[PDB]
Amino acid sequence: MNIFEMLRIDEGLRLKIYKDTEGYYTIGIGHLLTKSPSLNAAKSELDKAIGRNCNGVITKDEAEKLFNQDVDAAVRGILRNAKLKPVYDSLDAVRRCALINMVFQMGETGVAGFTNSLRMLQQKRWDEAAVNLAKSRWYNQTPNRAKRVITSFRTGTWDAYKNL
């Protein structure tokens, strides 16, 4: 298992514009298009992102390209972030994947706000961190995905995904 397979399980693949769990316009593998209510604004962002008139629809290939960009940008963002970088550097491979997953879903800023949990991860207090991460809107809103990520941080194995 790798970061790509992990995120592909959590986000799915949709080739037509869709609304995410939060009601936002998305396409492909969790690629947020806009937080704006206008499907029109979404179709415009999409065309800008792909470089063609897509009419709200993309190919598998296009979805995967966007995905490659997003994962890359998620990693670069962590590495550039003063709060995130030190945590990432302290982690093992699997747990690094878990942090990338959170950043891909909620953006750098959102994850950097998990001050206490970040501190516990840095200290390698697995059980305490899992408990703290669960006390969040994130967990209450998308509990099955959050549990999967949390288990990854808790155990340092891919057990939560070997099911799936």
Curated annotation (Swiss-Prot):
The keyword Iron does not apply. Substrate binds at L32, F104, S117, N132. The active site is at E11, D20. GO terms for biological process: cell wall macromolecule catabolic process; defense response to bacterium; peptidoglycan catabolic process; viral release from host cell by cytolysis. One of its GO terms (cellular component) is host cell cytoplasm. It is found in: Host cytoplasm. GO terms for molecular function: lysozyme activity. Keywords: Antimicrobial, Bacteriolytic enzyme, Cytolysis, Glycosidase, Host cell lysis by virus, Host cytoplasm, Hydrolase, Viral release from host cell. Changing D20 to E/Q: Loss of 99% of enzymatic activity. It comes from the Viruses. Optimum pH is 7.3. Changing T26H: Facilitates transglycosylation more effectively than hydrolysis; covalently bound substrate. It catalyses: Hydrolysis of (1->4)-beta-linkages between N-acetylmuramic acid and N-acetyl-D-glucosamine residues in a peptidoglycan and between N-acetyl-D-glucosamine residues in chitodextrins. Changing N132I: 5-fold decrease in enzymatic activity. Induction: Expressed late in the viral replication. The keyword Hydrolase applies. Changing S117I: 500-fold decrease in enzymatic activity. Its EC number is 3.2.1.17. HAMAP family: ENDOLYSIN_T4 (MF_04110). PANTHER family: T4-TYPE LYSOZYME 1-RELATED. Belongs to the glycosyl hydrolase 24 family. Endolysin with lysozyme activity that degrades host peptidoglycans and participates with the holin and spanin proteins in the sequential events which lead to the programmed host cell lysis releasing the mature viral particles. Once the holin has permeabilized the host cell membrane, the endolysin can reach the periplasm and break down the peptidoglycan layer. This is Endolysin. It comes from Enterobacteria phage T4.
